[model samples]
Structure formats: C-alpha cells, structure tokens
Target chain A: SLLTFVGLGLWDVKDISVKGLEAVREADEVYVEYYTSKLLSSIEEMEEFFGKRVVELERSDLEENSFRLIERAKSKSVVLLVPGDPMVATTHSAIKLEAERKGVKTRIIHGASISTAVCGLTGLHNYRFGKSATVSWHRSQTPVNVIKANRSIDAHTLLFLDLHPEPMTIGHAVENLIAEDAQMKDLYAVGIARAGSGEEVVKCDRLENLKKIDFGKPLHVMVVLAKTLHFMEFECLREFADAPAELERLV
Target chain B: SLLTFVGLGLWDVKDISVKGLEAVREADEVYVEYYTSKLLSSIEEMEEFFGKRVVELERSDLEENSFRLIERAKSKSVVLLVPGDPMVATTHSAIKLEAERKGVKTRIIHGASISTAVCGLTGLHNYRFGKSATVSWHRSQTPVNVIKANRSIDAHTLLFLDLHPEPMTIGHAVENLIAEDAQMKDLYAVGIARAGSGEEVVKCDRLENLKKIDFGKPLHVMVVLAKTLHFMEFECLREFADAPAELERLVA
Candidate 1:
C-alpha cells in the first residue's frame, strides 16, 4: 500500500496525467486538498470523470496531517490529491519522506502548472527565467521576502494572489501586486484568468491600471517581467493573449 | 527596417505563426542562424515551403556583423529565423535592443521551446522549476546558479546539451559536467536526445554513469533534477522513459 500524490495541474482535472488518472481509479480512498490552489471547477466534474469519491480537505488537514493520512492509506491504495503539479509544494515531499520512513512506497505524478500555461501562452524564454515569486494578501505593506526575492531578477515572476474561489476576483490579485510595488505601474503585466476552462481570458495591462480590470473567473495568474522582450515574445501575447494596443512598440 | 526573431519550433517551419511566416515570407534577404537546435527537415524544405531563399549561418557568420544585418533589415524586412522558440538564446534580445535603439521595430514570434517539452515528456511540474542552465562544450562546469537556484525548490532542471548539424559528436557536454564535481555523479540526471522529436529518447541515470548510453541523435537536452518524487512522477517516467527497474523504487 502506498500514498500517491497527484498534482491536478493549473486549470482542470483533465490536465492530470493518464498515470495520475489510473492512480485515482485504483485508490479506494481518495482525498483532495487545495492548499496551493482552489481549482477552477467543482469536485463533481472531477469525481465523475475520475470515478472516485473525493474527500475535500482544507489547508490545515492537508498540510498538518498529510503524512498520517499516507500511513492510513498504506493498506487502502489511498491517494492524496493536490493542485498544480503536486511536488511544487514542499509539504508533499515531506509527506512522501514520512511515508517512506513508514515503509510505504510513494509516487509523484506531474501535471501542468502556471509555468506551462504562461510559457505556452506568452512564449517567454522558459529557461531564461531566473526565479519566480508568488504575491500573498497582506495589509499595510508587502512581505519582506517577496520584495527581496524580486531584486536583480531579469527573470519573470509569476504572482499568485489570494483566492477563495468565490469572493476572489482578478482585481484582488491586481491590487495585491500594485500595493506591493508602487513602481510596478505601467510595468508590463500579464493577467490570466479561468485558464483551462471554456472561458479562459489572457489580458495585458500596465500595472498602473490592470487592478481595476475584471477577469470574471476565480482562478488567476499574474506576471511581472523585467527582461527585454524578444520578437517571438511579442507576437505570442499579441496573438495568443489579447494584447494591449501599445504592445506593438514596447515588446 | 525591423528585426523580427522567430522560432521555428522543433519539428517543422510551419510550426511558427502564420503571421511570423508572413513576416519572413517577403524579406529582401532571409537569414537563418541555427544555433543550439535543429529543424526537422533540410534547409531546402524551409526555402520551398516559404518561397524564400535562406542563408544558413555558422559560428563565424552568426557572431559577426549581426548589428549590420539588423541595420539592413531595418530598411527592408530582414527576417532572422531561429530553429526553435526564438528566445532560446538571449543573444537575440541583445540584437533586438540594438535595432530598437536605432528606431528599428523588433518583433519576437514565440514557439514551443524544449522547456515545455521537458514538462510533456517527464510529467514534472513546469512552473516549479527554477533557473535553467545549458552544459557547454568549452566550460568544464554548469553555472552554479542553476543548481543553487533550485536548492530550496522541489522543481526540476532542464539541461540542454550543445549539438551542431554536422561535423560535431564530441560528447563534450557530458565530459564538461563530469569534470565540474566528482560527487555530482550520484545526483539524478536525465539525458534527452531530440526533445520534441517523435523519435525522442529520454533516459535517467546517475550523472557519473550516463556516459555509456547511446541516444542516437544530434540534438539533446539533459535534465538535472532535485530529488523529490511523487507516485505519479515516478510511474510516468518509468513508463515513458523506460527507466531501469530499480529506478521505479528509487525514483519515487
């Protein structure tokens, strides 16, 4: 018996691997937790597709006792499901190690994350990006780590804002990034929402104004890029992502 | 005159945008500088498909008079063709900046890079990856920043090895990384030859022991990963890459 951590990818359950699908099918007990992301769609669709009863979990349950559940899954072919390529979150690995210590074999199945989506949409040099940072909701000022992590990086930063999947909108993510850096105004920022859904929107605005824009869906991703754009980088967002009119010259 | 750098993608010239194809379709002179990757078909395939004559570039030609070429493109539609996704090299950005400085419009038409290929092949989380490093023939080591950037990360690294179209099969990249750190041998490494190609081969082994494998292709990408495996990652790679039997247990 083993605990299998399946990353459900950035957008939908369909983004998961055939192998991951197989693991979920084989599992007698499947628990899904969304510490990283709340997901774009509902569990009904996923549960129906994968043919499993999913026990939804919160951050506390997934982060705090993920390993204990792994041990319990040892005899049941249990699955610990997660959002966005399971290994991206370090907590999953810690759980894997603990499972290994208990003599329970563990496996990580990969899936699409924002990296694949942004690169696929923007055509940014995927390799040249140095380090990426996520923006969290904080009052009064930005976190020191977020500010410090962004310095000297010609690489693009993928900013993930807080989401409740209901009350959260693209504006929340926009406002979070705006307050974090006042200088971010007019900086080329790409906002993506409802990725992998029927109504996916990839919109671009200078940081000064994008915060006011409405992206209709709960799932969103933002980018703060600081490198000179290559010719292909321009054409991709212009064509694939609906570009701002000013995008012609700047990119 | 503007310098538009377009990536042709892995398999075919038509893999590029119809707009990008149009941009290059009417150039006074079309220049294709192949560095770091190979197009699936011959130069003739590109010329016949697009109805334009191409000037294939080598090291000396690519490095020299690039600015002057941009200047010429500025007055005319000077299309600079790239083998894969255009931003695969930063040198294009430098050239584009120079053209922009001279009031020349620059455009980049993005295509699928090998970076995305690593995600498709291995089922690794694409975004979790940190900085990427290319193993060089001349250099004895990969940039420390690549590994160090990912030390705290559970992300994977995509290592693209250098290969030329003709007259180069030295295995210099493997020798170079091996010389950098003796202890580096034990770290899990993946060798990918002809990424994004239909006949692509991806295999995993210890960095020290990867030498004897034959991937049988000119183009190759190597992945050096931080060790953290989940059930899905291990199973997918074992099935897809044909990893060793013991690796199934060791990997996850």
Candidate 2:
C-alpha cells in the first residue's frame, strides 16, 4: 500500500517524467488537483496519455476530506498528480503527512517546477533568488516587501501571480505592485508567460514598460531583478529576454 | 538547427522527463558533462536508455571551447544533457549566450533539480528559502555567512556540497561549517543523501549531532533551517526527517 505524489511538470501533459508516467500507469487509482497550479491539459488528455482514468480533486477534498484519500492508500497504490512539483504546495505536504500518520506509505516523484525553471527561461542565476512571494488581490504589500527584502541583499525575488478564482495576468500583478508602492514602477522586472512551453514568452524591462506588453496566455510568473546584476546575467537578459539596452546602465 | 539543453534529472536515467528523453533521442548530436553534478548511472546506461550515442565533455571543453559546440548547433541539432536543470549552472548559461551570439536557436527542457527537490524531501516550504550557497573545501566562510544571512531573515538555506575532485560528504560539509563558525554547531541542519533516488536518506538534527550520523552514498545536500519554523514545518521535520521531539519547543 503506497501513495505516490507525481508532479506533471511545468506546462503540458508530456512533461511527466518516465518514472512518474510508469507510476500512474501501474497505479490502482490516480487523483489530481488543479488548485495549486494550472496544467495546460485537461483530465481527458491526461487519462489518454497515461491510459488510466483520472479523478480530479477539489481544494476541500484535499484540505478537509484528505482522510478519504488516505483511507484508500492504506490498501491500494494511489497516485496524486500535482501541477508542479508535488511538495512545493503546502496542501500536498499536509496530505502526505496525514497519509503517513494513517499508516500509509508515501513517495515523491519529482517534476520540473517554476522555481528552477525561471532560471533557465530568464537567465537569472539560481543562487541569486531569495524567498519567493505570491501576488494576490488581497496580499499586495507582502510581495512588495519581499521584493524590497531581496533587493536589499542584491538578490532576485520570484513573484508567483495568484491563480485562484481566475489567473492573475502580468498587468494586474504589476498594478498591484505599483498600488502598494508607487516607486516600485521604476524597478526592473521579467514577465514570463507559459514557461516550459513552446510558446513561452520572457520579457525584461522596467515595471512600467513590462506591464504594457501583451505576454499572451495565462499562468504567468514575474521576477523582480536585483539592484545590480552580473555582466553575464545582464547579457542573458538582453539576449534571451529582449531586455532593452538602456537597462545596462542601471545594472 | 537548434541547440537544446536537457536536464537528466536527479539520480538514475529514468529520472529524465519525457520531453528531455525525446530531445536526446531525436538530436543529431548529444553531448553531456558530468562535472557539475554526478549521475548515479554511467555513460553506457545513458546511451542505452536514450538510444543515442553521447559524447562527454570536460570543464575546459565547455568553458574555453564552447564555440565548437555553438558552431555545431549553427548547422545541426545538438543536445547538451546536464545533470540537473541546465541553466542552474553558470557554465551552461555562458554557453547558451555564445550560441545565440552565433545565430543558433536554443531551447531548454527543464528537469528536476535539488534546489526544488530539497523542499519535497525535507518538507521545507519552498517560499521560505533564501539565497542558496555551496560548501567547498576552500570556500568555507561563504556558506556560513549565507546561513547567517538566511537565519537573519528567518529563511532556510540549501547548502550544495562540493562535487568536484571527490564528492563531499555530510561529515566534511559539517566540519567546514563548524570550522568557519564554531558557534554554528548549535544550529539545526538536515542532511539529504542521494536526493530523488530510492536510496535517498534525510536526517535532521543539530549540526553537532548531525555530523556524527552516517548518511550513506555520495551526492549529498544539506539545509540549514531558520531560527523559527512554522508549526507545520516543525511537525514535518519531526515526522519525515526523524527530528527529535524537543525541537518542537524551539518553534514559535
């Protein structure tokens, strides 16, 4: 009896690893939750890919009724397919804890997450990222504070735009930042749309200029750059992200 | 003609994502470098798994001779397989820049990295992490300073042990940390061995007690926790990492 947490990776259905795909194909039951992050594929697409029927779980099903999932794991091999890396979300970690407490075994099959994907897509150094924050309609100041804190240490801050109710676009996210602190408009930011997908778009400029671009599609993430960037980082941003040359003086 | 950088994930050959596997299998030429992180499998195993002949590259091959790889990518589809997420290392980023300057297309098929894997293995919140640091034989004080900085912000630090020359172990890493700052011995640390592998081992305790434990195998990573942990975080450490019960009282 085992409960495996499988990550569906960053973008689409094919992003699942060979190990994760095998786990789903051989599992007795497969459940998925879309509340944490959005996967570009539908349940039918995932089912056809894995050759198994998939059950979609709501937020409450995992948060309040997780015992029901745990109960099944006591006897059957169950897999919970998460949008990104499974344990990155607090909800999945709680479910794993509950499952283990109920005498069910748990395993994590890692997948690509935006946390590290941003490094590749934007050419930002992984070691230069500080504590990540999410920008929501209600929580505006905290993300700005996180950017300030990261900037103070010459580190970048990855701001995850909220995906609940409706996905927050870069425009809304940038507006929220400026609403909280008007001076933040002058800061450099990178808007990444559909990371890990073929149609991915990464644009780097001052916050004022970035919010005007049509990044296209949903599920975007932003990064507030540090006060100063390494020469290579500046070049990568200019080459890969279409960053304006004038930003070099600031760097 | 495109240059694709694919991550081989952590641990064995099966850890590669389906996207990365297809990239390797369809590439005109595939080159891999093992200097950054160690993959448990050998080149033979990787070749058999991907059904593609893989050419290995040394540090100099990518650093000084990157134009050679870039030139090949200008007229052919070349895939560079990395141990972890491709762009996490500066060497790969530099290579990608050079290729683009030479008018070659580049794409990244992301893979699982220890940067995010540590969160899953140790139950540490991803948003609670600060700037990451690496511990090496020579650069001892920097990691200690990183930990101190992370602690100042009440954030955890993921310490990547050195993989060059010989893989550094938990014992060696802890000794380095304690050597740089002896008072750090009282801090809590989590030692993760062979992350993303079935033989993975995760143990949590104070630095003094942790340095004494035998975390099997090589390719280990450590996380120095924040001074105060959330209740769920503390419970996760106690349950998943075999943390001592008394550690609970330290959480606010």
Candidate 3:
C-alpha cells in the first residue's frame, strides 16, 4: 500500500510524464487538488486521460481532513495528482508526513514547475535568480523587499501572482508592487501569461508600460529584472519578449 | 519545419513527458548531447523507446558546428533531446538564438530538473534557496562564497557537482567544500544521488560524516543547510533523510 504524489506538469493533459501516467493508471484511487494552482486542462480531460474517476479535493480537504486521505493509503494504492511539482505546496508535504507517521509508504513523482520554467521561457539564467515570493492583492511589501534583496546581489526575483479566490492579474501585481515601493514604477520587469501553453505571452518593459499591456488569461508570473544583465540575456529578452530597444543601454 | 529542444528528464527513459516524447516521435531527426549531463538510460534503450536513430552530439559538434544543426532545422523538423530542462545549459540557448537569427522556428518542451527536485527530495523550502553554484575539482572558492552569501540571507545553498570528464562524487564535493572553508566540517548538508530514479538516495548529516557514506551513483548534488530551519523542515529531514536527532536544537 502506498500514497503517491504525481505531478500533472505545467499546462495541459499531455504535460504529464510517462512515469506519472503509469502511476495514475495503476492507482486504485486518484485524488487531485486545485486549491494551490489550477491546470489548464479540464477535469473531464484529466479523468479521460487517466481512465479513472479523479476525486477533486478542496482546501479544507487537504489541510483539515488530510488524515482521511492518508488512512485510505494504508490498504489501497492512492495517488494525488498535483498541478505542478507535488512538494512545492507545503500541504502535500504535510500529507506525506502524516502518511509516513501512520506507517504508510509514500512516493513523489515530480513534474515541470514554473519555478524553473521561468528560466527557459524568459531566457534568464537559472543561477541568477534569488529567492522567490508571491504577490497578493493585499498589497504586502514582502514581494517588494524580495525584489530589493535580489537587486542588491544583482540577482533576478521571480514573483508568483496569487492564484486563490481568483488569479491575480499582472496589472494588479504591478500596481501592488508600485504601491508598496513607489520607486518600482521605474523598474524593468517581465510579465508572463499562460506559461507552458501555445498562446503563452512574455513581455519585458518598465512597470508603467508593462501594467498597460494586455497579457491575456490567468496564471501569470512576473520577474523583476536585475540591475545588470548579460548581453545574451538582454538579446533573448529583446528577441523573444519584445523588450524595448533602449533597454540595451543598461547592458 | 521546427527546431525543438526536448528535455529527457532526470533519469531513465520514462522520465520524459508525454509532450516531449510526442515531439521526438514526430521529428525527422533527433540529436542528443551527453556533454552537459547524462541520463541513466542506454542508447539502445532510448532507440528502442523512440523507434528512431538518435544522433549523439559531441562538445565540438554543438559548440563549433551548431549552424550545421540549425541549417538542418530550417528545412526539417529537428528535435534535440537534453537532460533535465533543455535551456539550463547555455549551449541550448545559444542554439536557439542562432536558430532564430537564421529565421528558423523553435520550441522548448521542459522536463524535471535537479534544481527544483532538490526541494522535494530534501524537504527544503524552494523559496529558501539563494543563488546556486557548482563545485568543481579545481578547488574554486565560488561554491564557498555562494554558501556564505546564502547563509547571510538565512537561505540554503544548492551546489551542483561537475559532470564533465566524469561525474563528480558527493564525497569529493564535501572534501572540496571543507578544503575551501575549513569551518564547513561542522556544517550540516544533504547529498542526493540518482535523483528521479528508483535508486535515488538522500542523506543529511555533518560534512565530515557525509563524506564517508557511499551514495551509490554517478550524478549527485549537495545542499548546504541554512543556520536555521523550520520545525517541519527539521522533522522531514530526520524522517526522510536520516538526519541525526541531535540537530533538532537548531530549529528555533
């Protein structure tokens, strides 16, 4: 008996790894949670792909009633299909810990995560990123401080827009950043929408201009660029993300 | 008429995403490079799985003759299979840039990378990691400085061992760290081997003790723990990675 946490990958039903698909097909019961992040695919698509009825879990089911799911693993093969890499959410870690505490074996099957996907999508070097933080509608300064700290070291900071209640728009995230630190209005940043999808949009500009552009759809993320940029990174941003030509002077 | 970079994932053949596999099967030609990192699967196994002859690219083929491959992509659907995420290596980025410069279309199918995989394996919070650095056998102080910088922010450091020539062992990495900074002997760290494979191994301990243990594989990564840890993180390490109970006092 085991509890396996399988990552469904970044965007669609086809994003699941072959190993993850095998786990899902072999699972006696499958569970999924969208409270952390939502997949672009519908539940019907996922259920049809897995060839099994996938149970949807709410926030309370994972946080308050995790033991109920853990207990089921003691006798049957149970799988939790996570939107991205399973352990990125602490709730999954708690569930795994609880399952182990009750003498149930647990395993994690990883998938692509936005944490690293930002590197490929934006052409930013992976090693140049500092700690990541989330931007919420409450106007928290945590994201602002994170950007400042990353800037201090000439490192980029990735800001994940809040997803719960409703997905926070890139415009709202920029406004929140500027609200916390007025100087952010002049900062160079990147806005990525629908990452890992065919219609993915990536644009780089000053916060003022970036906030005005329409980056369609939900599940957006922002990157506050570093004070210094390698010439190649600058070119990638220009070629792929529509970075302003004048920004090359900073290189 | 497209050039695609497909990540083969962290381990064996099954690690490839369905999207990546589909890209490979539809491609007119498939190219793979082992100079960056090597997957656990054999060429025979990969060929059997893809049902295509995978051309192996050497360092010279990619660095010196990249245009040859870029030229091929202009008229054909070409796929380059990569270990881990395709763009993590600067060479792939260079190829993509060259392809774009030559007016060739390109796409990237990402896969699981050791960069984020360390978080799940070691139970460390992903946001608590600072800029990562690689530990080389050359005795470079870069990794030491990276660890110091990460510690200043109360964040952990993930050190990737050199994979060229031969895969660096975890023991050598620990020794290299302690050599650069003698104080590293007392520091707690985690060693992960064969990540994403069934034979994966993760262990947390003092560097001195960690160097003596055999992690049993070619690919390995090290994580230098932060000065402080959350209680849950501490428990996860102890329960999942064989961390000593005495290390609990640092959780506060």
Off by over 4 Å in 2: none
| lDDT per residue (tens digit) for residues A1-251 in model 3 | 89999888899998888999999999999999898888888888899988889999988889888999988999999999999789886667778777887899988888888887877777888887888899987867788888887787777888888987899989988888888889999889999998888568899999878877889889898899988888989988888889998878768
lDDT, ranked from best to worst: 2, 3, 1
* Docking quality class, candidate 3: medium
Better by TM-score, candidate 3 or 2:
2
Kindly list the per-residue Cα lDDT of model 2 for residues A12-94, writing each as its tens digit: 88888899999999899999989999788999999899887999999988999999898998889999999979988877888
lDDT of each: 0.63, 0.88, 0.86
**Models sorted by DockQ, best on top:** 2, 3, 1
When 2 and 3 are scored with DockQ, the better candidate is 2
Per-residue lDDT of candidate 1, residues B1-58 (tens digit): 6667765656665455444566677566788876657778688998998887988876
Whose lDDT is greatest here? Answer: 2
Give each candidate's fraction of reference contacts reproduced: 0.11, 0.74, 0.55
Every model's DockQ: 0.10, 0.81, 0.70
Worst 10 residues of 2 chain B by lDDT: B137-146
- Give the clashing residue pairs of candidate 3, or none: none
Model 2 per-residue lDDT tens digits across residues B42-152: 999998988879999898878998888888888899999999788888788898888888889899998888877888877789999998999986855789888887787
Ranking by TM-score: 2, 3, 1
Q: Lowest-scoring 10 consecutive residues by lDDT in candidate 2 chain A?
A: A137-146
